[PDB]
Ligand binder design. Structure first.
Ligand SMILES: O=c1cc(-c2ccc(O)c(O)c2)oc2c([C@@H]3O[C@H](CO)[C@@H](O)[C@H](O)[C@H]3O)c(O)cc(O)c12
Ligand SMILES: [Mn+2]
Ligand SMILES: [Mn+2]
Length: 180
């Protein structure tokens, strides 16, 4: 869907776009062909970045977007230095304030369905899950949202703006239907 490709290149910062293209190609997927996955990958990356800018300076270490060696360097480092259980999958962030890894979910489906799939995927209590939708819904572990409402509101409003713009360009219906 090349009109979606055009949208991704117009919508997302070039750093996010280049990171998403590398990520997909590493799984043998072509951004030019799986354009809905390209937009999805960019959105999750951007949310991960916005979330890391949510609170105090350096509250959050970013793990998402990092090459595997550096990602695992951050994760193993943190687990040696805080004694928190070493996750089996790379999470998205580490919360220095709350001493927990965070998995970040962005879903075109219902938040509760995605929360469960993440929980069942993770199989490790300590890691905090936080889900966003394009429709303003969000849900987190023990209903603990980590950030203040003003920072969550920027993320929720950004995801809404993205859905809206996709909608004006008749890309949203495909994109919504395309998810796992
Ligand atoms: O870099 C990638 C990152 C992720 C990813 C997704 C959710 C997270 O929460 C998360 O931390 C990371 O997913 C990717 C996927 C897929 O994106 C679907 C979502 O649109 C997922 O449902 C699939 O399961 C995935 O394999 C690709 O196809 C290619 C990719 O480079 C990636
Ligand atoms: Mn991740
Ligand atoms: Mn994630």
């Amino acid at each position: 869907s090349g009109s979606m490709e055009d949208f991704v290149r117009q919508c997302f910062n070039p750093m996010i776009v280049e990171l998403a293209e590398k990520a997909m190609k590493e799984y043998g997927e072509d951004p030019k062909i799986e354009t809905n996955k390209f937009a999805a990958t960019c959105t999750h990356l951007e949310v991960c970045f916005m979330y890391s800018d949510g609170g105090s300076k350096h509250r959050f270490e970013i793990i998402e977007g990092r090459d595997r060696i550096m990602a695992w360097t951050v994760v193993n480092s943190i687990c040696n230095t805080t004694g928190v259980e070493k996750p089996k999958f790379l999470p998205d962030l580490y919360d220095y304030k709350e001493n927990r890894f965070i998995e970040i979910g962005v879903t075109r489906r219902e938040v509760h369905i995605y929360y469960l799939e993440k929980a069942n995927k993770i199989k490790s209590e300590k890691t905090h899950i936080h889900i966003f939708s394009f429709t303003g819904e969000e849900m987190a572990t023990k209903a603990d949202y980590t950030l203040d409402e003003e920072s969550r509101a920027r993320i929720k409003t950004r995801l809404f703006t993205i859905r809206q713009e996709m909608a004006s360009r008749s890309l949203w219906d495909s994109f919504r239907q395309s998810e796992r």
